[PDB]
């Protein structure tokens, strides 16, 4: 559950990285002198690698979603266990109130 969702979070961050690499590449090209042309090539390869693996991750996840889609609303649930747990907790609360009352009558008896 955290796996595919964390993949989606990573692809969010890498879309940001793609835009920042676009911006950094045209930043270096706008310079009056741009000595680090090797670093320009590195930023260009970084940009294209970012776009390519963003495409790879999203295509893979659309494929995986195509494999496990059904168009049906999933008739499973967990309601009955929550109901039984609520009844158990209210049993405990009822016993707590009754124990408070018995202890209060014991304090009234011992108090005199």
């Amino acid at each position: 559950l955290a796996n595919e969702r964390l993949r989606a979070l990573e692809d969010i961050e890498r879309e940001i990285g793609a835009i920042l690499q676009n911006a950094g590449t045209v930043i270096l090209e706008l310079s009056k002198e741009k000595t680090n042309e090797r670093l320009l090539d590195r930023q260009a390869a970084a940009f294209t690698a970012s776009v390519q693996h963003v495409e790879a991750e999203l295509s893979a996840q659309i494929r995986y979603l195509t494999q496990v889609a059904t168009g049906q609303p999933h008739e499973g649930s967990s309601y009955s266990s929550r109901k039984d747990c609520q009844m158990a907790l209210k049993r405990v609360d009822y016993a707590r109130l009754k124990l408070s009352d018995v202890a209060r009558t014991c304090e009234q008896m011992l108090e005199n």
């Binding site: 969702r5 879309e15 495409e55 295509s59 659309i62 889609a69 059904t70 999933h74 266990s81």
Partner: protein
């Protein structure tokens, strides 16, 4: 249908990647300096400035659309990826069963201790002389 929605997601992804690549390549191509002929330097330069700004805006818009696609895919996964619903349901069920069993063990031990105290109190009260 589900197939139709998945196709639409595929179409959006292909379109966004294509748009980012095309806009960046076109900006790089315009960035070429060429010799002028019948273009009047000043007009050519303003037109080029407008083109670059519009293409950068288009790249940012494509990034926003990719964010929208990621959000829609996340919603689809949270709503109808059957395996994870089953593991969530099973984990919830097992946790609630353990809480119920703890409550019932506490109550049963309480009943036994209270019963022993009740036996002592019954003996004392009924055998009181008064």
């Amino acid at each position: 249908s589900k197939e139709t929605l998945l196709q639409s997601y595929n179409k959006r992804l292909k379109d966004d990647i294509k748009s980012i690549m095309d806009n960046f390549t076109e900006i790089i191509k315009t960035a070429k300096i060429e010799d002028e002929t019948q273009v009047s330097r000043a007009t050519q330069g303003e037109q080029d400035n407008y083109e670059m700004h519009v293409r950068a805006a288009n790249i940012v818009r494509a990034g926003e659309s990719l964010m929208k696609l990621v959000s829609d895919l996340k919603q689809f996964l949270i709503l109808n990826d059957f395996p994870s619903v089953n593991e969530a349901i099973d984990q919830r069920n097992q946790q609630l069963r353990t809480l119920q069993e703890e409550c019932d063990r506490k109550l049963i031990t309480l009943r036994d201790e209270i019963s022993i105290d009740l036996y002592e109190l019954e003996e004392e009260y009924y055998s009181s002389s008064s």
